[PDB]
Amino acid sequence: SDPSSINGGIVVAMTGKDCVAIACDLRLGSQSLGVSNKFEKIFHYGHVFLGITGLATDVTTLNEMFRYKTNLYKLKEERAIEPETFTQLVSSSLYERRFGPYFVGPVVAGINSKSGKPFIAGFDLIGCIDEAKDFIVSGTASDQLFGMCESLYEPNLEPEDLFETISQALLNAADRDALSGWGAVVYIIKKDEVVKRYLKMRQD
């Protein structure tokens, strides 16, 4: 009965040269029992990408909530929300439920359309912002991901190289966690094209 480790799963985001990458596993289980091998944890609202690990009902609820909020934002502002702004919206929304929180580990990723700067951010469950140049990690294999990223990562990787680094980071971390894996998805995000790749990984 630890909400953050019932369903299990991981998200990782990295920055490269004029690009960002965000990747997640596909497992949804009920503790030991694997239930779904199609449960994606990465969503997008325009050009801003959000990964969410933790209790799956809250992953779904928050996605539906941020779609709701970004839609009204776009109608009133007459433009798509930027990663820096969305990061603040996520933080506000999470801390609104400070004494009854969503059991989630969200990760924002995207490129600012005006400045062209790669941006990534992580949050705790109460909504504290963790901004990083290099990488953000989240989920049941966060320790493993921290170890993989900190050793594998180097600055200013090209999109094709960054893909290999984030993919190897996720795969090797997920294989050392019981509640993570069962397939993976990697988003490579450039200024005005986004490639989505499904990885082949061991299915245990």
């Binding site: 705790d124 469950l125 109460i126 504290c128 963790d130």
Partner: peptide, 4 residues
């Protein structure tokens, strides 16, 4: 959560 986070602490500093």
């Amino acid at each position: 959560f986070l602490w500093x």
